[PDB]
Paper text:
Lastly, Chain B of the RedM-SAH complex and unliganded-RedM chain A have slightly rotated Rossman-like domains compared to their dimer partners with an average Cα displacement of 1.8 Å between each pair. The two domains of each monomer are separated by a gap of ∼12 amino acids between residues ∼132 and ∼144 ahead of the long interdomain α-helix (α11), which lacks clear electron density in each structure. Each RedM structure has a disordered region around residues 133 to 149, which includes the analogous position (Y140).
Among bisindoles, reductasporine is distinct due to its dimethylpyrrolinium structure. Its previously reported biosynthetic gene cluster encodes two unique tailoring enzymes, the imine reductase RedE and the dimethyltransferase RedM, which were shown to produce reductasporine from a common bisindole intermediate in recombinant E. coli. RedE reduces compound 4 to didemethylreductasporine, and then RedM catalyzes two methylations to give reductasporine. RedM is a homodimeric protein with monomers consisting of a largely α-helical N-terminal domain (α1-10, β1-3) and a Rossmann-like fold C-terminal domain (α12–16, β4-10) bridged by a long interdomain α-helix (α11). The C-terminal domain possesses a Rossmann-like fold typical of Class I SAM-dependent methyltransferases, with a β-sheet of five parallel strands terminated with two antiparallel strands each interspersed with α-helices.
Numbering used by the authors:
A (entry chain B): 12 to 136, 146 to 344
B (entry chain A): 12 to 130, 157 to 344
Amino acid sequence: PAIDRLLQIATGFMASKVLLVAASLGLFTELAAGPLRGEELRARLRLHPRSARDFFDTLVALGVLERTNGAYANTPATAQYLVRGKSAYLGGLLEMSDARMYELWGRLDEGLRTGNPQNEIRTGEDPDRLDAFQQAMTGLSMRSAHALAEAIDWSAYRTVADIGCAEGTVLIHLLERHPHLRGTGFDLAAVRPSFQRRHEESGLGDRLAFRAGDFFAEPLPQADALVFGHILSNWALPKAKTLLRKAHEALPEGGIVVIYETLIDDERRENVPGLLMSLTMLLETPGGFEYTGADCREWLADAGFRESRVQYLAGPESMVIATK
Amino acid sequence: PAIDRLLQIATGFMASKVLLVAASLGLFTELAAGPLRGEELRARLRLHPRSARDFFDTLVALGVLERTNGAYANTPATAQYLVRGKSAYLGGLLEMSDARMYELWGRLDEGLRTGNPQNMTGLSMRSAHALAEAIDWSAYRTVADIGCAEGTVLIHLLERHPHLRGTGFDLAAVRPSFQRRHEESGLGDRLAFRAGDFFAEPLPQADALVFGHILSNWALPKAKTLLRKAHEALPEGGIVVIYETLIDDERRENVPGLLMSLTMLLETPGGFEYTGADCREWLADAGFRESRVQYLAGPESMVIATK
Ligand SMILES: [Cl-]
């Protein structure tokens, strides 16, 4: 029945917390080398004997652990993605959800009533957990980057600029996939060291450059293609529109702007991740918001772009592409 | 792939809170009289204009609201089960989850590290109805519900089977709530309340003793003591009826039961969820002649034993 599905979604915070805490404990990393009996896994995690077995068995019933003759083991997915120290490790997303986002969403009611963010802005304010979270975000960025490299005919362009490039994961992957491209990452000066470390590791050399700048205070770098990944959604609409104006001014005739986000579907009735992201923007920012491709096409029209289209990218991400 | 499903479970707290807040706001009750435009719904719920439309459309995308021409309406399921003031209302679970359980589960890690705890009528109805249908109550004349609370389950049993005489047993402080339901039922002298502490005195004698979500609240030695006392209270051929959100015997499949065991960790000093096989062992040690486990109502199962 529909009511049963509704109640299951409504009480999903419990199964969520089980996985989140297992990630914070590094449970799957403890099992990386091989299976462990419950008592040994309990001892290594410093858990109390009252509920350790219940906890491990809940993970089994959720399908994220195996158990064979009393020995717990990783599933394929947890061995691949939830073991610390592997390049594919995504558990940092769960560690930060456990440490911060679960309680932030506990303030949804106050966010909805006040329209105000409920995070550190409301309060006026672990390095290894930050690093793990950044690794997971770099992994998600990589999925978008792999899709972006195939979703656009990059042979039509010689130069690309990523606006708000952070450590430069997307730009680096684009350049590695398309050796004819030259790239410029644009971000605040504080981002330079993290970007340049990835630049060094990539071996791209002079094909990649970093430009320090504040995109709300200075012009954008000229390039054939400008990329805005999860940029416009952080700001109220008038600020987003100034960026589209700057993008139009930085591009040549025939150049493109590529905007990607966890877009809501145009009818605002299908895309759960995009709509949940709009509530995340409520909780995290003073004026940020998630939008639809149709919304963005309107803004791009106002900014003078000749044409535009909406295109699926990968996972929860989609993009709007416009031509000057 | 499996990692995508895993991530969806892990981030399930978000869609959960959307539904929990909708229940706490009484949103579905506001739509009970008919569809409302978003501005009208926002105004009636006193939500800020920044994110009200986002919130309403999240409910639409989750499949719990309908929307056309900018007007929001209940789905059949929320119209039937999430409107307050109706006997069918199941939203109490969501209101209590929003007010208490979401934050309590926020302390799951401290519960796991320490072993220490970290801390509505419609919810018992499905099990109450099934209990009256799943047992041949014609074989018995008297029944006692041990830990009867406000008496919902026992009252329904007596209404369904007019030949039965019933005793609700609970702490003295429960009597006012029980009396209210007792008066409303019209059962009269066929139903009685008996005040007592089942860890301090014998249980009421009856042909059948019912333990609905009782044993799981207490440490195993105390649960075993209650089963001993049940055996002492019953006649030859009498039955003990236990029902719980049991974990499966192999402890690898029943997510509701396993989650309930973690809820018992967070809420009680000694409670735990258990399996049917567990309970049958306890029942044998307490002297019961035979026992069986049966599915009762969805995630609820019952264990029955004969003296
Ligand atoms: Cl063991």
